RNA sequence: GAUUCACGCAGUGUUAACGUGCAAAUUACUUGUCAUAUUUGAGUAUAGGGGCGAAAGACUCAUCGAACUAUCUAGUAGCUGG
RNA sequence: AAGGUUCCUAAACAACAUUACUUGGAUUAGGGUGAAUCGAUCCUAAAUUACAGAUGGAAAUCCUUAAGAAAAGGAUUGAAAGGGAAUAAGAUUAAUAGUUCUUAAUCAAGAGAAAUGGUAACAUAUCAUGAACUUUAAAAUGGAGUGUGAAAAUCUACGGAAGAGUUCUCUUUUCUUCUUAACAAAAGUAAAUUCCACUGAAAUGAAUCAAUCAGAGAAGUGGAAUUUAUUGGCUUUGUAAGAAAUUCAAUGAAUUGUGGUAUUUUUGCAGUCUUCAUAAAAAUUAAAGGGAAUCUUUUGCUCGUACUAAUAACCGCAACAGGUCUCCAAGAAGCAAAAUCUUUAGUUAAAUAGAAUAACGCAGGUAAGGGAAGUCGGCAACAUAGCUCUGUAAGUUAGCAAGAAAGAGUAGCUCUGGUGAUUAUCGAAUCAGAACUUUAAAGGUUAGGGGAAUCCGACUGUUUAAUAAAAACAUAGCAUUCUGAUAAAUCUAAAAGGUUCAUUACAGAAUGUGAUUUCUGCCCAGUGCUCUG
RNA sequence: UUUCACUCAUUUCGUUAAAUGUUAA
């Protein structure tokens, strides 16, 4: 069908090759399906901006503006655990 | 308007103290007894003469009676 | 000359907040016994989408610790909440993300949001969208704590200032490239009136101090006193520096 | 074709100013008013359409029955039966846990 | 307009009074100036204004 | 299109008739008469209008009872 | 915020018509455009060294490189007319 | 909305509608607007305005619930297009009618130890008690596109009844009528979605135009509920044939079946897509948690209601080719609400005509041979034009260019075949093919001229109302500066004053450049800005 | 005069002015 343009074929011709390669990543992982964390689902899908809905599992969830869980987001967690293990131990 | 299905009840209309006026009408197959009370018009659609009579003789006579045909009146 | 568009600004005629559709006021609760001494426990009913701002707003109900009812609240959205989770806060609460905890009992090295300046005045700092701020150190000494703002600036504030663990919902919101004129005319759809910007070179010498001549140029440099008069401060102000950075 | 007019002063298609074309004896067609579509009610925490309950204006509820407007159940025409069992369990089981948790453990 | 107020609605009652000439019997008056009602107007002519 | 095609939708009254001073004077969205000088409680009068006063001013109506007080 | 036609709308050209006009800016054909930075009604807000302006010193009731209206005011004129 | 008596009738024509008028939106005199159910009135939106308080020399300004001994919680106003208790059919007037009359309804306010059934989803002509207090829901929510249920219109199949048109040439013919309300009833019978019970799916299945779904349980079977323009969606029933329509006779008589795997419109429903856009509030109503306490009849007030709504009733000095927001919407032909013609309705007059047929014009045309030689310049006009098939380059951000360019076919008539439903009968416009004929076929109307390059602007968009529509403005992208909020910018004479800010650095405010690619060199002396000095 | 400590005018805030401080349990 396309031979490297996948997604952002919809924009046709008028927007700079480096600006719809940059909106291609965003888009397709805006788009997707992501691992629900309560019932391990391929079933979450963004409503608006930072809210995630899991469709045949009936949660909202906060996230990242295009995907479920953010890079910092992740680490913060991580963090937070260490943090708190360590205070609730001496 | 309310239709009346079978002859019980009409008879009970007819004995209750509830009444108005009554008008028959006939028509080319059937009879329509309307009842006119004070709140509803009710109907009972006959298709059996003999039943109809005894109707006919059911309505007290203190009330008026309005029979209906191919020409209205 | 005229009086310039920086200066229509402050009038506030059609430059007021379009500020309709909004949820409402978020922050934490107002401060009690039970938050001082105790923990009141949260359930995150929903979490919903605020217009003119980037990060969900969840919307909390808390009991009544005192009378009968429910105390509808109106957070602003922790990274990984979701709906259903309970969330505690008071100076007893666990370090979890989502719960509300004074300054001085997040560990140094927790990362918090939505802090407050001064106990009790229901959050001012790291409410934007993926933003967050770090506790530095503690000082048992006066009672304050060293926290790291999301712009980098160190800031000082009372060891009783609440705060919430975690990461405000919705980051990475501003990579996505903007690609046309119409995308950026919705995103101003729930903020004030700024967004199609004449530049000062185009306007004429009423209009504007950069009004010019038989060339679209300046003529005089841009960087101004941080005293120039409302109407003459037009550009960089007080500039320490100029040029691409290195 | 017979073409109508609005029989109200109204003028303009808003949703209140619906209208109906029906036929009328005679061959002529006359304007009805239509009323709006309107919304059921919904479970109190999964916010699911409940059933038995028809989708009516606010006000035609209190016309119609008592038992017409409610589901004869625990928190009928408030929560799901769904709704319901969930509230049922938490109370029994959190209660029970209480009891051997703490309170003589 | 086919809606209006019952005060303006009045006052457009007595426009339409107003509108009226001299009647014959006081153009009979000895010493009678009075023939015609100059403050007459006709609604294609000139707006009463209100 | 400044002129004759410009006045085609002009159709929506400013001024109404004023309840003080029964002119067609009484702007609608500034709730305000531009001639008597509505809700302020004194009359709307001005040195630099010096017809204006002439034309609604004691003496121009009826006088209905000052006119006794005065001959008494 | 893809290409076009239509209801509509604008005003590219004829530098056509008219130019004491249908009209104190319109008509005909040609041209363009004709739903998301769209078109549009009512209500409401912003006022003169002010407002509003996708910026032409443009618009603010046929009046705008500072509106309309009245008072100072019969403003002054080494200049023109009588 | 605006106008305001212009509405209807009669008398009358001095003036007015660039001639005239017996006409008139013109003169004179009368008549005309009927509501418990339509609106205003009620609620709140953007916003607006009070007492007290704060500010001001003053006029006055600020504040709208904060400052108050004021207002269980916050005052006034703000929508004839937002929310909203409840009415329809026929008839009637010279003119009013969801308003009058006949018939038939509805709504609100009044008067005369406390239930069963079902496993369950849930169900019961009022039934079957339910206070304070609290919660939930409704009122009350974007847009696009696809599929589909139902009604109406149009078309059509079978069967008719009545009337009309054509008829020396034929035509078992062509046309018209064959209808039904609000509110209720429940013979018969639908589409879609969601739940409940039994059972437990792998050899994985179920399903849509597309999707989508399943051991937190699919498919199957049996049930429950909701929606589908009032009761309960459609046929049917009461109202109701006594009305109405079409005929006939001179007031009285006749008829008023059943369908369609067709098109459009309207109205719902189901899932899909899209947003750094998530697309109102209150009056008002119901339900729940809790357990405090022990059918008939009356009335329904105030205000609007006439008429135009425009090539003559509104705004432009006027009966001005300008301008001004909406609802209903037939046939042909076609992809098409296009152009062109017609039916129902409206009108034949809308700043006067008659004769002659000079020049010069305005509007519409054609033209031998040549073909831009005319001209500042192919300005103007000519020319291409639909659909099908074949074919399509350099360049390129790899998406495009592209309807590239270029070529062929197309009519009429007589036939042939493909695409289904139901179980032999029935039905749809669509495609392909073949003989024959002619005036050799898109062209009545509608309906792209094409190609090779250079400059500017990246693009979609906006702009000097009335001589400039563009290379100008905007734009996305890029970059710089300040600010930790008691701040930055900034309005105000002042102010527990105001705007961004219902905000918090992924933010606010001030600027330059103008998509993408490639790249932004050297200079801190001069003038600015700054320094943690 | 500078540097300190306090609050008591003063500033900026928050709420239904809803457990502040010190003992007690």
Redesign the pocket.
Known sequence: ??????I???????????????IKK??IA??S?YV?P??????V???????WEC????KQIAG???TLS?I?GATVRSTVRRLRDAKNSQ | ???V?EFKQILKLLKSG?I??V?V????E?T?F?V????????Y?CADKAKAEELKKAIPKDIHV?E?????? | ???????????????????????????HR?????????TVRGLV?SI????????P?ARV?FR?????????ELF?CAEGLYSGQYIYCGSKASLHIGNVLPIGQCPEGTVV???E??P????????????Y?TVISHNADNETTRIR?????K?TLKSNCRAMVG??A??????????????????????????????????????????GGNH???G??????????????????????????R | ?????????????????????????????????????????????C????????????????????????????????????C?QKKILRAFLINEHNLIKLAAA | ??????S???K??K??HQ???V?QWFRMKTGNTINYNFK??????????? | ??????????????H?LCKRCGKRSWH?????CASCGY????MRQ???????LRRRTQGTGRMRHLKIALKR
């Open positions: 069908r396309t031979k490297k343009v996948g952002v074929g919809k924009y046709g011709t008028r927007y700079g090759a480096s600006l719809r390669k940059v965003i888009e805006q788009h399906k629900c309560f019932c391990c689902k391929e079933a899908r963004r409503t608006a901006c930072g809210i469709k045949g599992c009936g990242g503006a295009y953010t910092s | 308007p309310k239709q299905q509830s108005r006026a008008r009408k006939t028509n080319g059937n329509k309307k006119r009370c004070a709140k509803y018009l009710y109907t659609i309005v209906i045909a191919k020409k209205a009146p | 000359g005229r009086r310039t568009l920086s200066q229509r600004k402050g009038r506030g005629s059609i430059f007021k907040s379009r500020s309709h559709h909004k949820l409402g006021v978020a922050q107002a401060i009690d016994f039970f938050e001082r001494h105790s009913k919903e989408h605020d217009p003119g701002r980037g990060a707003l109900v009544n610790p005192r009378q009968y009812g429910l105390d509808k602003i949001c939505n802090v300046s001064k009790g005045d229901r959050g001012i700092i790291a409410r934007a969208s993926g933003n701020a703002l999301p712009s980098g600036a800031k990461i405000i919705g980051g990475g919101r501003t990579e996505k490239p903007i690609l046309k004129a119409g995308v950026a005319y919705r995103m101003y759809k729930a903020k004030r009136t700024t967004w199609p910007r004449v530049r000062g070179v185009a306007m004429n010498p009423v209009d504007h101090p950069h009004g679209q140029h300046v005089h440099p841009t960087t101004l006193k941080r005293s120039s008069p409302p109407g003459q401060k037009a550009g960089k102000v007080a500039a320490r520096r100029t040029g691409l950075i | 074709a017979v073409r109508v007019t609005y029989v109200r002063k109204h003028s303009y298609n808003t949703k209140s100013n619906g209208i109906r074309i029906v036929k009328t004896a005679g061959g002529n067609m006359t304007v009805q008013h239509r009323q709006k579509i309107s919304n059921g009610v919904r479970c109190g925490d916010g699911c359409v409940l059933a038995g309950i028809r989708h009516i204006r606010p006000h035609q509820y209190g016309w119609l029955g008592k038992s017409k407007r409610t589901v004869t159940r625990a928190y009928g025409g408030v929560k799901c039966h769904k319901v | 307009t086919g809606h209006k107020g019952f303006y609605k009045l457009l009652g426009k339409i509108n009226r000439g009647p007459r107007r006709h609604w294609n002519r000139r707006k009463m204004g209100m | 299109t400044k002129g004759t095609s410009c006045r085609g939708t002009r159709h929506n009254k400013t109404i609608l969205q500034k709730q305000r809700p302020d409680a004194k001005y040195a630099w209008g010096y017809k204006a």
